[PDB]
Amino acid sequence: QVQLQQSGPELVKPGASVKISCKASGYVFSTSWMSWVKQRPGEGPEWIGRIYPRDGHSSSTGKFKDKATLTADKSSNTAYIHLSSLTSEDSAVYFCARDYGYYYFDYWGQGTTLTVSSASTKGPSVFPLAPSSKSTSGGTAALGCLVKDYFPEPVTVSWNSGALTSGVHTFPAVLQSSGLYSLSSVVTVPSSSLGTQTYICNVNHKPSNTKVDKRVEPKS
Amino acid sequence: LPPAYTNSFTRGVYYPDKVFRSSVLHSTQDLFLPFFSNVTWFHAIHVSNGTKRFDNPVLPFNDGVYFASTEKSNIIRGWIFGTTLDSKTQSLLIVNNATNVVIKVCEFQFCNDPFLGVYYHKNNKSWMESEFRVYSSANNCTFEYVSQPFLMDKNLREFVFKNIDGYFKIYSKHTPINLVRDLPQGFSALEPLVDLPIGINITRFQTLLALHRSYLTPGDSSSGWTAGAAAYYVGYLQPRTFLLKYNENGTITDAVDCALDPLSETKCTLKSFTVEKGIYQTSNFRVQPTESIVRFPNITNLCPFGEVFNATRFASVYAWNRKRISNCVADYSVLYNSASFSTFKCYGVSPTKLNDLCFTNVYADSFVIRGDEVRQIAPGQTGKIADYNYKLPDDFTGCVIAWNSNNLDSKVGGNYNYLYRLFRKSNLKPFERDISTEIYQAGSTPCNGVEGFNCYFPLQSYGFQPTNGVGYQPYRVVVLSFELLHAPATVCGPKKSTNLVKNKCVNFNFNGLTGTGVLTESNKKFLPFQQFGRDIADTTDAVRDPQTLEILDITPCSFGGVSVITPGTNTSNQVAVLYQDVNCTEVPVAIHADQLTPTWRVYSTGSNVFQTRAGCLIGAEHVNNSYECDIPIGAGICASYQT
Amino acid sequence: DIQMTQSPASLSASVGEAVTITCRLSENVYSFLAWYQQKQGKSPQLLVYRAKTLAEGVPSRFSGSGSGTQFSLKINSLQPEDFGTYYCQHHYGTPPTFGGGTKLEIKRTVAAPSVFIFPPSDEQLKSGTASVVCLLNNFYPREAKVQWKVDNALQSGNSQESVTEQDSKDSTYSLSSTLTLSKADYEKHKVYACEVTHQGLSSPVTKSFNRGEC
Ligand SMILES: *[C@@H]1O[C@H](CO)[C@@H](O)[C@H](O)[C@H]1NC(C)=O
Ligand SMILES: *[C@@H]1O[C@H](CO)[C@@H](O)[C@H](O)[C@H]1NC(C)=O
Ligand SMILES: *[C@@H]1O[C@H](CO)[C@@H](O)[C@H](O)[C@H]1NC(C)=O
Ligand SMILES: *[C@@H]1O[C@H](CO)[C@@H](O)[C@H](O)[C@H]1NC(C)=O
């Protein structure tokens, strides 16, 4: 009944300016403060500031005073945070959270990852991971797909149009030497289930806007 | 002994944040000691003959005091910070005795000779402390922190002290040195050491030097110790913009002051230590003093506290009045900043941060109780008033405010209108109002509403004769109870518009205009209903004041475009400064704002003049002989590096 | 500014045990602190604000305690879904500060990894680059070491290791190690294998395969 949605992850060149949109529902936008929190990956998040829509007032700390400007539109209950002079240090995940004015946050949006780098989005390269031709003791079979190159962080992994949800494991993408992020996801299936059912790995990369579905089956 | 000066090394850089960065050129702004500054080399004590030279320069603390010591024996012991260095004001005492470092915040009444007393003990052969002659008093002690000695154990000792928003920070570092008097030209980062929420005003600094049993004697003759080795360094931190460099391990390898010189300004604007040959524009040609200007209009919807405070009539404690307060802005420091209030105690929150918090509902309850009874109102207390007239939760959040009113609530015959419930069947719960007039049946006899030997009227009233005295005098006591609920809050503190300042080229952000410039009076009158006067361009020369009723002109700091020409940092260190569209006579016009910044009088070199239509050029010689262009300065003439 | 200290930084316990996380602040904040639970890739969720006040829709297992400088978050009974990172944050006014982060790991019985070798797809060989990965499935404890042996010779620097978050129910981690090589290096070596060393494993186990289904 309190839903907070944010725009998709954004790739921006360093030094530019970016805007992030947060949407609120199920409660009066004006009566409750809406804030912003920025979290470095592998590191504790940090408070940014608050905005109170009915008067447009915004208070923020000096560290992000120059970086962040809070704007709240009462019409659509959508408050936009504007960041400028983007640096690699700025690139992180940002959250919008409802505040009842006490600076403690009961609800949180899904968050948006902000990426700052010179290079652009690279299309995924997908390689299916064929199960090895084995006796497969215990009725246990292993299969997956390999995504070779992601410049943006976001990954979309689906199994047979997302139908299969048991034994699904998607390892986090790992930064490579070239900087491209490679990700591999796998799922465990019954051995008899191999030839009987067709297994499809469905991958999407929204920044590249490329949707690829690959069929996987043991070679020969 | 006259003061002396020495060249500051690049050392003095401290970590601005506890955040870790690796292989990142991160730019930060804070108080810093500028590079190549003048450091007042206090030769504190000189002994050749055993001539005592007792010197304790009480320097102004200012923004940040950079400290450096070369004492091999570590004679210096801590530092002293205080506004007035007496019991009149709060002072900070730091003592570095070997057992532990003492950080105690008290209103010490310091003596004329503020030294550390240590006597040599023959039996133990130890330099253990004798007594603290540095001060004489310990009044209203607030904050104490104890740790191991950090300056205790040919090694340079450096420290940086900063006092910001009532928060005290210390940075420290030690490095061996073989230079007798010259500060080593090495980059030594100063890691954070200890942070203190002292929250007092500090204006002037004084260093502390320990006097041994030799100097403890009243006579000028020394028993067995001489302080000739005493010597240290002092420098003043100023607001500066820095371009720190983090390595893979995160250590601050090197940094450049954006205000050090034009090449460092080019480094700052290019966000890299190494710049190539060419022409580049800079912006941080000096720092912004004071505070950036952000505006909010003065408050209008005040919470009606004064009505409760200044109501003509107050009710008795038993029938205590209650008012709900919401949907307004309230100032409590103003109530705190009033000597008319005899008792001002807060529980569960600090009075200082009162304007910082928001509450959905604030309930104010007021009544009249005599002087000695004010103690019971505090949470968790016991007594007749607490039990049968008014009680507070043990987890109460808010403040209790009281003041004498014998002048108003007493008369010649004494006021009997004010009443206190003397008797009741059971102790009151918190926030419980009892108005029953039923006779208290202390005995077993059912009186049926008739006064008797064991039947008493539960209510009792004061006499309140004016000559009864304080402790019996009426005290109009108001209780501020704050309700903290999971609901959108209404009551919030005021927003400060930082008063007003003039003639400082700083950032103006009137309700978020995000501009930069100097504050000057504007004779021109823009459209009044606008909070800020809007110019045809986005940047407005004059900005109207939401706080006051005025419009103020603004003006950027660099009216000339600071275009710096220099070869690669590998190539040469020569510089060429071009003020675009600025006459060589207007170069002094720039030099005015530049010389407001220290050492830029020296910079622009001696202002050796060469004039071009693109702009006046300083720092190079015009090549009369025709040559191919080396850097496209403009107007078809270019200068090149040479011996 | 305000300093957050959390002890212990890392903690692990089994299901149904009692876990307490301590928070320390430089200044004295009277009762305005909030506890947040965080899982990898998720938004934080409010658990306890003030000191004793449980948040809405929070299991009764969670409990908050402490006053002033000392603030304790106590879990009377651990659950498999309770895994994640826990933060202590004051809300005594601007600016709110989050804690460093306390890692909580749900301890369970030692489980041997199900190891699988994955020969690279012929498509990637067509692409000109070779990536070989072998898999660790549903193993506890978290600690595990994989050794990539190329033609019965140890190698390093060509393999990247990634570990998923502890399973919500299975309570067991998964590990993937991807060896990166050129197609020429693939053609040079006939035999490829990774050796898996784990506490659950009685002895090191290796899975091997030969190029070209040999
Ligand atoms: C230090 O003082 C000397 C004395 O005149 C002066 O020439 C020099 O410019 C000063 N340097 C700094 C950095 O203040
Ligand atoms: C009572 O005095 C005046 C009345 O206008 C005003 O300051 C306020 O209402 C009260 N005083 C204080 C200090 O609150
Ligand atoms: C508040 O601001 C308005 C408009 O700027 C002004 O007319 C009024 O005098 C101000 N009041 C005070 C008390 O400063
Ligand atoms: C600069 O000096 C020249 C020569 O005296 C003069 O013509 C000009 O008006 C002055 N000002 C500017 C902005 O060029």
b/e for C103-131, b at 16 or more Cβ within 10 A? ebbbebeebbbbbbbbbbbeebbeeebbb
The protein residue with its alpha carbon nearest to ligand 1, atom 4, reads: B5
Euclidean distance between CA atoms B162 and C75, whole angstroms: 41
Contact C174 A111 (CB under 8 A): no
Euclidean distance between CA atoms B266 and B273, whole angstroms: 9
For CA atoms B179, B181, B185, B188, give the dihedral sign: positive
Alpha carbon distances (Å) from B618 to A81, B340, B502, C168 = 44, 64, 31, 69
**Omega of the bond leading into C141 within 30 degrees of 0 (cis):** yes
Q: Which residues contact B175 (CB under 8 A, 6 or more apart)?
A: B155, B156, B158, B184, B186, B188
Same domain flag for A133 and A87: no
* CA distance to partner chain A, nearest, from residue B511 (Å): 8
Beta bridge mates, C47: none
**Residue A176 forms contact with C (CB below 8 Å):** yes
Beta bridge mates, A63: none
Q: Which residues contact A144 (CB under 8 A, 6 or more apart)?
A: A128, A129, A184, A185, A186, A187, A201, A216, C118, C135
Q: Which residues contact B433 (CB under 8 A, 6 or more apart)?
A: B319, B320, B322
The binding-site residues of ligand 2, defined as CB within 6 angstroms of any ligand atom, are B 306, 309-310, 335, 338
* CA distance to partner chain A, nearest, from residue C119 (Å): 8
Could you write out the DSSP letters of every residue in C147-158? EEEESS-EE-SS
Structure tokens at B458: 């539960």
Q: ∠ at Cα C48 (C44, C54), nearest 5°?
A: 125
Q: How far is the CA of B335 from the centre of ligand 2 (A)?
A: 9
Picking from A87, A116, A145, the residue at the C-terminal end of a domain is A116
- Of the candidates B342, B463, B466, the one whose C-alpha atom is nearest the C-alpha of residue B404 is B342
Helix (H) or strand (E) holding B477: strand B474-483
b/e for B226-238, b at 16 or more Cβ within 10 A? bbbebbbbbbbbb
Query: What CA dihedral angle connects B470, B476, B477 and B478, to 10 degrees?
Result: -160
* CA distance to partner chain A, nearest, from residue B485 (Å): 9
Gaps after which residues in chain B, C–N over 2.5 Å? 48, 153
Residue type, B446: P
> Which method was used?
cryo-EM
**Residue A217 forms contact with B (CB below 8 Å):** no
Residue C75's CB: how many other CB atoms inside 10 A?
20
SS3 B262: helix
Indicate which of A59, A64, A70, A104 best probes the interface with C, i.e. most C CBs within 10 Å of its own CB.
Answer: A104
Picking from A64, A90, A116, the residue at the C-terminal end of a domain is A116
Query: In testing the pocket of ligand 1, which one of B38, B41, B238, B601 has its CB within 8 Å of the most ligand atoms?
Result: B38
Contact B24 A88 (CB under 8 A): yes
Pick B197's closest partner by Cβ from C27, C30, C56: C27
Question: What backbone torsions phi and psi does residue C142 show, to the nearest 5 degrees?
Answer: -60, -40
Residue B378's CB: how many other CB atoms inside 10 A?
15
Could you write out the DSSP letters of every residue in A102-119? SS-EEEE---EEEEE-SS
Pick B489's closest partner by Cβ from A28, A66, A102: A102
Residue type, B583: N
Euclidean distance between CA atoms B470 and B475, whole angstroms: 9
Same domain flag for A131 and A182: yes
The protein residue with its alpha carbon nearest to ligand 1, atom 1, reads: B38
Alpha carbon distances (Å) from B438 to B213, B455, B457, B554, C11 = 78, 10, 8, 73, 61
Locate the chain B residue with the closest alpha carbon to A104: B486
Residue B510's CB: how many other CB atoms inside 10 A?
23
Locate the chain C residue with the closest alpha carbon to B357: C93
**Residue A123 forms contact with C (CB below 8 Å):** no
**Domains, in order of start, for chain C:** 4-107 (2.60.40.10), 114-210 (2.60.40.10)
Same domain flag for A171 and A95: no
Same domain flag for A83 and A108: yes
* Cβ-based contacts of C49 with chain B (< 8 Å): 486
Separate counts of helices (H) and strands (E) for chain B: 6, 37
Residue C54's CB: how many other CB atoms inside 10 A?
17
DSSP annotation of B438: P
DSSP annotation of C82: G
Contact B360 A31 (CB under 8 A): no
* Cβ-based contacts of A44 with chain B (< 8 Å): none
- Of the candidates B505, B474, B469, B529, the one whose C-alpha atom is nearest the C-alpha of residue B597 is B505
> Using an 8 Å Cβ cutoff, are B616 and B608 in contact?
no
Beta bridge mates, B323: B364
- Centroid of chain to Cα A140: 31
> Using an 8 Å Cβ cutoff, are C23 and C99 in contact?
yes
Say how many domains are in chain A.
Answer: 2
What residues make up the domain containing A52? 3-116
Contact C93 B167 (CB under 8 A): no
Euclidean distance between CA atoms B588 and B606, whole angstroms: 11
Q: How far is the CA of C116 from the centre of ligand 2 (A)?
A: 80
> Using an 8 Å Cβ cutoff, are B516 and B507 in contact?
yes
Structure tokens at C89: 């944050």
Structure tokens at B395: 């987890």
> Using an 8 Å Cβ cutoff, are B10 and B190 in contact?
no
> Using an 8 Å Cβ cutoff, are B292 and B507 in contact?
yes
- Of the candidates B56, B12, B312, the one whose C-alpha atom is nearest the C-alpha of residue B185 is B12
* CA distance to partner chain C, nearest, from residue A85 (Å): 23
Locate the chain B residue with the closest alpha carbon to A40: B19
SS3 B387: helix
Same domain flag for A38 and A108: yes
Could you write out the DSSP letters of every residue in C94-123? SSP-----EEEEEE---B--EEEEEPPPHH
> Using an 8 Å Cβ cutoff, are C102 and C6 in contact?
yes
Q: Quick check: CB of B549 below 6 Å from ligand 3?
A: yes
* Cβ-based contacts of B507 with chain A (< 8 Å): 66
Q: How far is the CA of B294 from the centre of ligand 3 (A)?
A: 17
Could you write out the DSSP letters of every residue in A34-98? EEEEEE-TTS--EEEEEEETTTTEEEE-HHHHTTEEEEEETTTTEEEEEE-S--TTT-SEEEEEE
**At which residue do the structure tokens 């940075």 appear?**
B171
- Of the candidates B624, B340, B357, the one whose C-alpha atom is nearest the C-alpha of residue B494 is B357
Same domain flag for A68 and A147: no
Euclidean distance between CA atoms B6 and B180, whole angstroms: 13
Beta bridge mates, C28: none
DSSP annotation of B376: G
Picking from A98, A116, A134, the residue at the C-terminal end of a domain is A116
CATH number of domain containing A44: 2.60.40.10
For CA atoms A80, A86, A90, A91, give the dihedral sign: positive
> Using an 8 Å Cβ cutoff, are C195 and C146 in contact?
yes
Euclidean distance between CA atoms C117 and C27, whole angstroms: 55
> Using an 8 Å Cβ cutoff, are B395 and B468 in contact?
no
Locate the chain C residue with the closest alpha carbon to A185: C176
Same domain flag for A157 and A66: no
Euclidean distance between CA atoms B617 and B584, whole angstroms: 8
Structure tokens at B43: 């030769």
Q: How far is the CA of B38 from the centre of ligand 1 (A)?
A: 6
Contact B197 C30 (CB under 8 A): no
Same domain flag for A177 and A211: yes
Same domain flag for A162 and A106: no
The protein residue with its alpha carbon nearest to ligand 1, atom 13, reads: B37
> Using an 8 Å Cβ cutoff, are B539 and B247 in contact?
no
Contact C118 A110 (CB under 8 A): no
Q: ∠ at Cα C142 (C138, C146), nearest 5°?
A: 85
**Omega of the bond leading into B458 within 30 degrees of 0 (cis):** no
> Using an 8 Å Cβ cutoff, are C85 and A97 in contact?
no
B4-270 CATH, one of 2.60.120.960, 3.30.70.260, 3.10.20.600, 2.60.40.1220:
2.60.120.960
**Residue A197 forms contact with C (CB below 8 Å):** no
Same domain flag for A75 and A136: no
Structure tokens at A77: 């209950």
Ligand 2 atom index nearest CA of B310: 1
Structure tokens at A138: 């215990």
Report the DSSP pairing between strands B76-82 and B204-211. Answer: antiparallel
Same domain flag for A149 and A202: yes
- Of the candidates B614, A44, B64, B207, the one whose C-alpha atom is nearest the C-alpha of residue C89 is A44
Structure tokens at B525: 């009158």
Alpha carbon distances (Å) from B15 to A82, B193, C157 = 28, 10, 34
Q: Which ligand is nearest to the CA of B532?
A: 3
Query: In testing the pocket of ligand 2, which one of B303, B305, B308, B309 has its CB within 8 Å of the most ligand atoms?
Result: B309
Question: What backbone torsions phi and psi does residue B353 show, to the nearest 5 degrees?
Answer: -85, 15
The binding-site residues of ligand 1, defined as CB within 6 angstroms of any ligand atom, are B 5, 36-38, 599, 602
Could you write out the DSSP letters of every residue in A103-167? S-EEEE---EEEEE-SS------EEEEPPP-S--GGGEEEEEEEEEEESSS--EEEETTTT--SS
Contact C26 B397 (CB under 8 A): no
> Using an 8 Å Cβ cutoff, are A88 and B24 in contact?
yes
Segment 12-41 of chain B within 8 Å of chain A by CB? 21, 24, 26
Greatest alpha-carbon span in chain A: 70
Helix (H) or strand (E) holding A204: strand A199-205
- Of the candidates B6, B10, B7, B8, the one whose C-alpha atom is nearest the C-alpha of residue B189 is B10
Helix (H) or strand (E) holding B490: none
Contact C1 B167 (CB under 8 A): yes
Which residues of B lie closer than 8 Å to C, measured between beta carbons?
A: 18, 167, 195, 197, 348-350, 353, 356-357, 397, 484, 486
**Residue A88 forms contact with B (CB below 8 Å):** yes
Q: Where are the alpha helices (DSSP H) in B161-234?
A: 213-216
Could you write out the DSSP letters of every residue in B271-309? TSS---SEEEEES-SS---S--EEE-PPP--B--HHHHH
Query: In testing the pocket of ligand 3, which one of B302, B497, B549 has its CB within 8 Å of the most ligand atoms?
Result: B549
Residue B172's CB: how many other CB atoms inside 10 A?
17
Same domain flag for A36 and A135: no
Euclidean distance between CA atoms B493 and B281, whole angstroms: 44
Locate the chain C residue with the closest alpha carbon to A48: C95
> Using an 8 Å Cβ cutoff, are A189 and A136 in contact?
no
**Omega of the bond leading into C96 within 30 degrees of 0 (cis):** no
- Centroid of chain to Cα A85: 23
Q: What resolution in angstroms, rounded to 1 decimal?
A: 4.1
Q: ∠ at Cα B615 (B612, B618), nearest 5°?
A: 85
Residue type, A72: A
Structure tokens at B226: 């001489």
Q: Quick check: CB of B298 below 6 Å from ligand 3?
A: yes
